[PDB]
């Protein structure tokens, strides 16, 4: 989720912020962009159970 | 150490000693085949060395050809019988 598109930074010199952008210039691939991945996605390897003697 | 130390080892049970474990037909086949083939070229070289009493040279040459000392000793012994005259 969030990483099926193609996006790369434009770099400095074009008067825009440095995040990855889709072809056309749309923000992508950051947690602060509409449509990007989570900063730290949830995973099922969380320890769900607990032990008791 | 490859054993565990204890005196009286084996003192509780009685062990079973298994039997330790020719074929004149095979010797007969080799004698017919030997008759219509002869020996290999390396084997003929060894016989010539053995006739001249260069025993250590014969062993060196057989180790170089065969690559294993027990087989090289078994071959030079095998070839002396035809190399005595």
């Amino acid at each position: 989720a969030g990483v099926q598109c193609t996006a790369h930074s434009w770099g400095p010199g074009r008067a825009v912020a440095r995040l990855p952008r889709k072809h056309g210039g749309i923000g992508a691939y950051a947690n602060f962009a509409r449509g990007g991945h989570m900063a730290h996605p949830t995973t099922v390897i969380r320890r769900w159970c607990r032990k008791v003697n | 150490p490859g054993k565990v130390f204890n005196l009286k080892k084996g003192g509780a049970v009685v062990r079973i000693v298994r039997k330790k474990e020719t074929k004149p037909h095979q010797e007969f086949v080799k004698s017919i085949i030997q008759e219509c083939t002869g020996m290999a070229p390396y084997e003929m070289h060894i016989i010539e060395l053995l006739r001249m009493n260069k025993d250590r040279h014969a062993l060196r040459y057989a180790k170089k050809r065969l690559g294993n000392i027990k087989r090289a000793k078994a071959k030079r012994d095998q070839l002396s019988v035809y190399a005595r005259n």
Binding site: - | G2, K3, V4, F5, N6, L7, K8, K9, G10, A12
Partner: protein, 148 residues
């Protein structure tokens, strides 16, 4: 639980305890254990003597069940006898009906000598003895024995 953690008490503080002058960067010392002989030498000599180098013979394959060797002291021997029987044995310090304790059945090989025994004859069968385990046992009237 996330709701009792120290990190949630830093909302509104610009920098979550990592400082303004220094800051929080990726790997300012390198990754892992690197640097132990150069720029972490003050750490490695203070807390880890004998981390660098070689020492002693090597064995290309150790046999774990050959080198295994359990041991028991003489002060633990009488606890192998069940409690229902200990009183009677102490009562009659017999030379002709002394208790026999075979320690391999309980899973020990050698008998060492820390401690002391009660004043009561007893027979101990094992695979090896230390010199003062034997000495304290013969002091009591006991005998050592070797077993298969």
């Amino acid at each position: 639980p996330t709701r009792i953690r120290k990190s949630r008490k830093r909302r509104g503080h610009r920098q979550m305890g990592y400082g303004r002058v220094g800051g929080h960067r990726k790997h300012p010392s390198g990754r892992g254990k690197a640097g132990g002989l150069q720029h972490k030498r003050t750490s490695f000599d203070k807390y880890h003597p004998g981390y660098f180098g070689k020492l002693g013979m090597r064995n290309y394959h150790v046999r774990r069940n050959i080198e295994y060797n359990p041991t028991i002291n003489i002060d633990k021997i009488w606890s192998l006898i069940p409690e229902e029987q200990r009183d009677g044995f102490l009562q009659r310090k017999s030379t002709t009906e002394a208790p026999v304790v075979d320690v391999t059945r309980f899973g020990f090989f050698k008998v060492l000598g820390r401690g002391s025994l009660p004043q009561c004859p007893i027979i101990i069968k094992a695979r090896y003895f230390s010199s003062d385990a034997e000495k304290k046992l013969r002091e009591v009237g006991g005998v050592p024995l070797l077993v298969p």
